[PDB]
Amino acid sequence: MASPADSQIQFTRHASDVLLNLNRLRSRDILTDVVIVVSREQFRAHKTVLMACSGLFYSIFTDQLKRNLSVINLDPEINPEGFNILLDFMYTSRLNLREGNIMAVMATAMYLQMEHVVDTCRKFIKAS
Template identity: 35%
Template sequence: GYYSVRATHTAGRGTGCSSGPCPELVTDQRLCQSKSHQDSVLSALNQQRKDGLLCDVTLVAGDQKFHAHKAVLAACSDYFRAMFSLCMVESEADEVTLQGVTSVGLKHALDFAYTGQVSLQ
């Protein structure tokens, strides 16, 4: 299924066991956890990036422009986290030109940020 339910340990040992000490038993908490939530959210954000949907920054490298989400970039990179959160002029800019970065290099970096993988062919 899409969601799994995992019990969490919240109490001491159980009682009423007929043989030996009882293992830790869960008394009152359960956690509903998606097995694929992170992957599906990142996949949806990547599709939004490709479609130019809900993107809040355009990165320019060489002669190419790339749409992206500042939050995704900041979550994946200390460089972008500083750029977008430390009162730098880029934090308010809709378009940021990256000096010394090739368009191929930026494409690979963005692909990795949004998918966790990159093709270096």
């Protein structure tokens, strides 16, 4: 006895509402379970959201060896501004690309294994 997801009532704003509420929990540090250290800066997040948005974080936390880490030290060459823009993106679906930050954002998205964002960065370069 079943009901295929395809025949069910679609709530067109549900996914966007969930992501906005996850961002609100991040803003209040509710159930955050990791600190991402990026040179002199620290960013708290939900490992579930990191894994949902990044090949790097997916590959780290899917491994039972690293599943329970509370601190991740990113590569020391990663631009914290680049990382912060992408973390915002993960929690908002909005990507802040500017002439001043495109190379930092693109290099960081390559490291985080966010292929659709890297492609978008290549589109932004083609448009400037």
